[PDB]
């Protein structure tokens, strides 16, 4: 609340009005459980409607909420695997800590992965080592909070050129109906966005970006409608002349089915345009 969120979180709401509600080129399947601690699973299935590529997941999460512990295991159809153990408020409240291990047998490359977090009123602070064959590298995050107002540095340091690969700044202010988010990443993408709750049923973004120096501007608009509380519709576009129209459905409890048109302008419909299909199950 007087907590501020993580740095790659500045801006989230706003990336979630463009981003959510749509699936183009994709149908998707989604299988959720949930459960307030104990076993819990997400399995998931694309199939790519350009490349005929079909991709699949799982997850199996085991929350010990009494001690802060979350256990995770992925695996998807590429082969790979993966463990996550993690401890929250457990030495300190608010302190984060994470090991994360992958594995690929189809190149025999595995990761490894430590991920610290500490929040508090007005701070929230990260530092995460990548124990890469050609890192270490460390990600180091901190964001501050002041009345509403935010202010947030993030650098990635490589080992290996043992130099700043990344060094971006936020600016921000944020209440629960309103959020504006500013970036600039390496001195040279510039970004700029508004999110707003208008009021109970529609949230709206406006999303900018350009780059030092190149006279050029990208900019799109969007909108998310809570039609009822079984149905949902989305629609944005963008100076590319792009238009996503995006519907969502609650056929039955738990099942919700997604359609999701993109179209080009000025070829609308008039050349081909992006389809999706998601559906998801929560049981």
Same mark, same amino acid.
């Given at each position: 609340?007087?907590?501020?969120?993580?740095?790659?979180?500045? @801006? #989230?709401?706003?990336?979630?009005?463009?981003?959510?509600?749509?699936?183009?080129?994709?149908?998707?399947?989604?299988?959720?459980?949930? *459960?307030?601690? /104990?076993?819990?699973?997400?399995?998931?299935? *694309?199939?790519?409607?350009?490349?005929?590529?079909?991709? /699949? *997941?799982?997850?199996?999460?085991?929350?010990?909420?009494?001690?802060?512990?979350?256990?995770?295991? #992925?695996?998807?159809?590429?082969?790979?695997?993966?463990?996550?153990?993690?401890?929250?408020?457990?030495?300190?409240?608010?302190?984060?800590?994470?090991?994360? *291990?992958?594995?690929?047998?189809?190149?025999?490359?595995?990761?490894?992965?430590?991920?610290?977090?500490?929040?508090?009123?007005?701070?929230?602070?990260?530092?995460?080592?990548?124990?890469?064959?050609? @890192?270490?590298?460390?990600?180091?995050?901190?964001?501050?909070?002041?009345?509403?107002?935010?202010?947030?540095?993030?650098?990635? &340091?490589?080992?290996?050129?043992?130099?700043?690969?990344?060094?971006? &700044?936020?600016?921000?202010?944020?209440?629960?109906?309103?959020?504006?988010?500013?970036?600039?990443?390496?001195?040279?993408?510039?970004?700029?966005?508004?999110?707003?709750?208008?009021?109970?049923?529609?949230?709206?973004?406006?999303?900018?970006?350009?780059?030092?120096?190149?006279?050029?501007?990208? &900019?799109?608009?969007?909108?998310?409608?809570?039609?009822?509380?079984?149905?949902?519709?989305?629609?944005?576009?963008?100076?590319?002349?792009?238009?996503?129209?995006?519907?969502?459905?609650?056929?039955?409890? @738990?099942?919700?089915?997604?359609?999701?048109?993109?179209?080009?302008?000025?070829?609308?419909?008039?050349?081909?345009?992006?389809? @999706?299909?998601?559906?998801?199950?929560?049981?």
């Amino acid at each position: 609340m007087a907590v501020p969120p993580t740095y790659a979180d500045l @801006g #989230k709401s706003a990336r979630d009005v463009f981003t959510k509600g749509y699936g183009f080129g994709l149908i998707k399947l989604d299988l959720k459980t949930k *459960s307030e601690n /104990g076993l819990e699973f997400t399995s998931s299935g *694309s199939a790519n409607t350009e490349t005929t590529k079909v991709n /699949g *997941s799982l997850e199996t999460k085991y929350r010990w909420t009494e001690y802060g512990l979350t256990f995770t295991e #992925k695996w998807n159809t590429d082969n790979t695997l993966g463990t996550e153990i993690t401890v929250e408020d457990q030495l300190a409240r608010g302190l984060k800590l994470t090991f994360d *291990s992958s594995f690929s047998p189809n190149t025999g490359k595995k990761n490894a992965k430590i991920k610290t977090g500490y929040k508090r009123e007005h701070i929230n602070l990260g530092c995460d080592v990548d124990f890469d064959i050609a @890192g270490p590298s460390i990600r180091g995050a901190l964001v501050l909070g002041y009345e509403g107002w935010l202010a947030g540095y993030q650098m990635n &340091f490589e080992t290996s050129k043992s130099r700043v690969t990344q060094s971006n &700044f936020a600016v921000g202010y944020k209440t629960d109906e309103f959020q504006l988010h500013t970036n600039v990443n390496d001195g040279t993408e510039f970004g700029g966005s508004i999110y707003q709750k208008v009021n109970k049923k529609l949230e709206t973004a406006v999303n900018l970006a350009w780059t030092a120096g190149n006279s050029n501007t990208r &900019f799109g608009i969007a909108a998310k409608y809570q039609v009822d509380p079984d149905a949902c519709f989305s629609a944005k576009v963008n100076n590319s002349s792009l238009i996503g129209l995006g519907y969502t459905q609650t056929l039955k409890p @738990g099942i919700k089915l997604t359609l999701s048109a993109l179209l080009d302008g000025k070829n609308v419909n008039a050349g081909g345009h992006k389809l @999706g299909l998601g559906l998801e199950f929560q049981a």
